[PDB]
Write an enzyme that holds these catalytic residues in place. Structure first.
Site, PDB file in Angstrom:
ATOM      1  CB  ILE A  44      -1.004   0.020   1.177  1.00  0.00           C
ATOM      2  CG1 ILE A  44      -0.320  -0.339   2.501  1.00  0.00           C
ATOM      3  CG2 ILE A  44      -2.159  -0.926   0.898  1.00  0.00           C
ATOM      4  CD1 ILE A  44      -1.128   0.028   3.726  1.00  0.00           C
ATOM      5  NE  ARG A  45       5.361   0.497   4.140  1.00  0.00           N
ATOM      6  CZ  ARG A  45       6.634   0.435   3.750  1.00  0.00           C
ATOM      7  NH1 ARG A  45       7.219   1.487   3.189  1.00  0.00           N
ATOM      8  NH2 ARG A  45       7.327  -0.684   3.923  1.00  0.00           N
TER       9      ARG A  45
ATOM     10  CG  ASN B 158      -6.098  -1.556   1.365  1.00  0.00           C
ATOM     11  OD1 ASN B 158      -6.025  -2.427   2.239  1.00  0.00           O
ATOM     12  ND2 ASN B 158      -6.522  -0.324   1.620  1.00  0.00           N
TER      13      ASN B 158
ATOM     14  CE1 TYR C 175       2.946 -10.617  13.555  1.00  0.00           C
ATOM     15  CE2 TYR C 175       4.224 -11.140  15.523  1.00  0.00           C
ATOM     16  CZ  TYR C 175       4.081 -11.152  14.148  1.00  0.00           C
ATOM     17  OH  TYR C 175       5.074 -11.698  13.368  1.00  0.00           O
TER      18      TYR C 175
HETATM   19  N1  NAD Z   1      10.674  -9.906  10.012  1.00  0.00           N
HETATM   20  C1  NAD Z   1      10.687 -10.836  10.967  1.00  0.00           C
HETATM   21  O1  NAD Z   1      11.642 -10.960  11.718  1.00  0.00           O
HETATM   22  C2  NAD Z   1       9.498 -11.747  11.122  1.00  0.00           C
HETATM   23  C3  NAD Z   1       9.442 -12.667  12.173  1.00  0.00           C
HETATM   24  C4  NAD Z   1       8.333 -13.491  12.294  1.00  0.00           C
HETATM   25  C5  NAD Z   1       7.304 -13.377  11.360  1.00  0.00           C
HETATM   26  N2  NAD Z   1       7.372 -12.486  10.352  1.00  0.00           N
HETATM   27  C6  NAD Z   1       6.248 -12.412   9.408  1.00  0.00           C
HETATM   28  O2  NAD Z   1       6.652 -12.248   8.043  1.00  0.00           O
HETATM   29  C7  NAD Z   1       5.713 -11.417   7.346  1.00  0.00           C
HETATM   30  C8  NAD Z   1       6.431 -10.239   6.683  1.00  0.00           C
HETATM   31  O3  NAD Z   1       7.355  -9.706   7.623  1.00  0.00           O
HETATM   32  P1  NAD Z   1       7.952  -8.218   7.587  1.00  0.00           P
HETATM   33  O4  NAD Z   1       8.876  -8.131   8.776  1.00  0.00           O
HETATM   34  O5  NAD Z   1       8.486  -7.917   6.213  1.00  0.00           O
HETATM   35  O6  NAD Z   1       6.716  -7.245   7.894  1.00  0.00           O
HETATM   36  P2  NAD Z   1       6.954  -5.648   7.902  1.00  0.00           P
HETATM   37  O7  NAD Z   1       6.271  -5.040   9.106  1.00  0.00           O
HETATM   38  O8  NAD Z   1       8.409  -5.342   7.617  1.00  0.00           O
HETATM   39  O9  NAD Z   1       6.108  -5.223   6.609  1.00  0.00           O
HETATM   40  C9  NAD Z   1       4.703  -5.457   6.565  1.00  0.00           C
HETATM   41  C10 NAD Z   1       4.173  -4.833   5.288  1.00  0.00           C
HETATM   42  O10 NAD Z   1       2.759  -5.019   5.208  1.00  0.00           O
HETATM   43  C11 NAD Z   1       2.220  -3.825   4.639  1.00  0.00           C
HETATM   44  N3  NAD Z   1       0.774  -3.616   4.909  1.00  0.00           N
HETATM   45  C12 NAD Z   1       0.185  -3.163   6.036  1.00  0.00           C
HETATM   46  N4  NAD Z   1      -1.166  -3.092   5.879  1.00  0.00           N
HETATM   47  C13 NAD Z   1      -1.450  -3.507   4.626  1.00  0.00           C
HETATM   48  C14 NAD Z   1      -2.662  -3.687   3.790  1.00  0.00           C
HETATM   49  N5  NAD Z   1      -3.897  -3.406   4.262  1.00  0.00           N
HETATM   50  N6  NAD Z   1      -2.502  -4.146   2.529  1.00  0.00           N
HETATM   51  C15 NAD Z   1      -1.288  -4.434   2.026  1.00  0.00           C
HETATM   52  N7  NAD Z   1      -0.147  -4.293   2.725  1.00  0.00           N
HETATM   53  C16 NAD Z   1      -0.165  -3.845   3.999  1.00  0.00           C
HETATM   54  C17 NAD Z   1       3.078  -2.688   5.170  1.00  0.00           C
HETATM   55  O11 NAD Z   1       3.091  -1.581   4.269  1.00  0.00           O
HETATM   56  C18 NAD Z   1       4.444  -3.328   5.261  1.00  0.00           C
HETATM   57  O12 NAD Z   1       5.240  -2.984   4.120  1.00  0.00           O
HETATM   58  C19 NAD Z   1       4.703 -10.930   8.372  1.00  0.00           C
HETATM   59  O13 NAD Z   1       3.491 -11.677   8.243  1.00  0.00           O
HETATM   60  C20 NAD Z   1       5.349 -11.221   9.709  1.00  0.00           C
HETATM   61  O14 NAD Z   1       4.382 -11.516  10.722  1.00  0.00           O
HETATM   62  C21 NAD Z   1       8.437 -11.677  10.217  1.00  0.00           C
END
Ligand code: NAD
Ligand code: NAD
Lengths: 308, 307
Positions: A35-36, A52, A141
């Site tokens: 969405i960004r 979205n 979460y």
């Molecule tokens: N990064 C880690 O260390 C880690 C650890 C455990 C689990 N995860 C899981 O991996 C997945 C991705 O991780 P991440 O760290 O890149 O997340 P992040 O927080 O870095 O990025 C999440 C993205 O989702 C987008 N977003 C928010 N609302 C939205 C909507 N309505 N429609 C579309 N996009 C939307 C945001 O713009 C953001 O870019 C997540 O499901 C997270 O739970 C990550």
């Protein structure tokens, strides 16, 4: 050859996933979406599309129009902002999940959704945490990720939905905005090259499961490329290493003996760190499909320092 | 003297619960609500109001206007009908819960939502099932009831939401209009009118069961219980467990010329095997002093009186 959509792919992991997949399938067969607004370099990496996840109507368009057959559901609000914004995190995480489930179910899409070390609770085994155990997280979460695991699995039994789920440990990558409970382990490498001094916000001996980004994405691709029959379950723990700020500080000092560490614990982040497991047991993941990590504490530190 | 709203209370349990609560707190202090048209006799029992659970704005109205402090959330689609309509059952059981949660938190409402034996799966402890264990149900109704547990408890630890939850066994009552545990109700209606009942579950398939009175009483008692005597917010509620064969046995103490023909429906059978056989209610009995009244013998006696 499959056509890939990556949902919410402008966060920490998404770009890396896009790169790995585009190398595997071709630049044009991986569609990045968020969405960004995307940085110039990532926009020119291949196809990017606004998406979205709360807008179900739009997901049908994208999946039909681009003939998507593989979906990686990365969009979420994590444990950081999730607690501060319960309403929205509930919407994006749970309603967003349902929409992605429905679209994939209707259009025969192979679906990846990550789960997390946050999907466990204080009543869960923590040393280690197995794949099948009590899950009672007290974070919106985590609760929503428990829901992700259960819903995903149900949709695999009710319909033939190819749902696959890895519980990621805390992921460490080079240039990652802030966090985030496991965030110190990313920021530490910035301050190691900037000044030689880093203030840590978790206790010196708070053990958490961790993993380098290359391992995280390699596991993600592998399990997706795996033959169905070899998957006895659809949600797996994925593991590489467990460490503490103190243990990380030594590995840093192996290369930079001058490196200095201070502490100022944030109770909010410390409280949810204590609620998570210390080690993840991935016996099943290694046995079923061929999961092996390539990065432990020494090499993780070496690569992370190589980016500075 | 709390002001009560019963959500989706035209099903099997809501009417009996209305009766119990009205005799305790006062007729006009308990509002019954659903989306369906209420029978005449139940409409005149006390205040009734149309309330669609999917309509968040209407719930805000009702709760404020009728100054509700106690809410009992009974609206759902159960295991059998839910597998047919997944999208609908997902809305009613999930966004319906979300709405009920948001309202109860904002307006400082004591919230009761019942969970079920359905909230367990084939990977769970089955004999007996404890309060804390692996919960991996393979039905949408089951998945939404686990979600109910986790969300409700989260809102307790996040906000100040007084969320109280019981896991019901299959409830038995005389006034019941095609679920999994349905056999134990359709049996009596075919027992007094002698004397062969066709059962759709295997002879030795144990499930936790309970008579409506105990179910309703526990539901009140857990709400009346002091908050500080509650070590958790989700309790197993237990009374008895039996197989179809055991049920036919206790019926013979009153009508010896009773017989059963087992023609097993595999679809309901399979999910009965995915459920626990016994519920352990240690914590319930310990914390808030739960004790059942009806065991298999005196369950049959009470049921037959209604025929
Ligand atoms: N990064 C880690 O260390 C880690 C650890 C455990 C689990 N995860 C899981 O991996 C997945 C991705 O991780 P991440 O760290 O890149 O997340 P992040 O927080 O870095 O990025 C999440 C993205 O989702 C987008 N977003 C928010 N609302 C939205 C909507 N309505 N429609 C579309 N996009 C939307 C945001 O713009 C953001 O870019 C997540 O499901 C997270 O739970 C990550
Ligand atoms: N009775 C049992 O065997 C049993 C066992 C375990 C748990 N429970 C739980 O106890 C509660 C009550 O069970 P029951 O036997 O009355 O079930 P039921 O199916 O008889 O009643 C459900 C009621 O909710 C209403 N409803 C459906 N959608 C609605 C909506 N959108 N808005 C408002 N109302 C709606 C229905 O019209 C129906 O009257 C449920 O939460 C159920 O999960 C029941």
């Amino acid at each position: 050859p499959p056509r890939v959509l990556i949902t919410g792919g402008l966060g920490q992991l998404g770009v890396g996933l896009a790169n790995l997949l585009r190398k595997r399938f071709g630049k044009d067969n991986v569609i990045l979406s968020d969405i960004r607004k995307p940085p110039a370099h990532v926009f020119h990496s291949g196809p990017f599309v606004y998406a979205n996840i709360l807008d179900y109507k739009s997901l049908r368009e994208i999946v039909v129009n681009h003939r998507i057959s593989w979906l990686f559901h990365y969009s979420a609000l994590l444990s950081a902002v999730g607690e501060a914004n319960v309403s929205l995190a509930r919407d994006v995480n749970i309603t967003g999940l349902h929409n992605v489930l429905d679209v994939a179910a209707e259009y025969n899409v192979r679906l990846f959704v990550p789960s997390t070390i946050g999907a466990f609770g204080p009543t869960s085994p923590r040393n280690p945490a197995p794949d099948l155990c009590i899950q009672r997280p007290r974070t919106i979460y985590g609760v929503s990720k428990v829901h992700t695991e259960l819903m995903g699995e149900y949709y695999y039994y009710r319909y033939g939905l190819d749902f696959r789920c890895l519980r990621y440990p805390g992921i460490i990558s080079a240039d990652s905005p802030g966090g985030g409970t496991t965030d110190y382990a990313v920021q530490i490498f910035h301050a190691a090259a900037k000044n030689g001094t880093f203030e840590c916000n978790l206790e010196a001996g708070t053990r958490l499961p961790m993993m380098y980004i290359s391992d995280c994405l390699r596991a993600t691709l592998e399990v997706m490329e795996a033959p169905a029959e070899r998957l006895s379950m659809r949600t797996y723990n994925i593991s590489a290493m467990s460490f503490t700020p103190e243990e990380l500080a030594q590995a840093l000092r192996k290369h930079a003996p001058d490196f200095q560490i201070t502490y100022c614990v944030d109770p909010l982040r410390q409280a949810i760190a204590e609620s998570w497991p210390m080690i993840l047991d991935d016996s099943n993941a290694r046995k079923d499909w061929g999961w092996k990590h390539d990065f432990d504490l020494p090499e993780l530190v070496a690569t992370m320092l190589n980016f500075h």
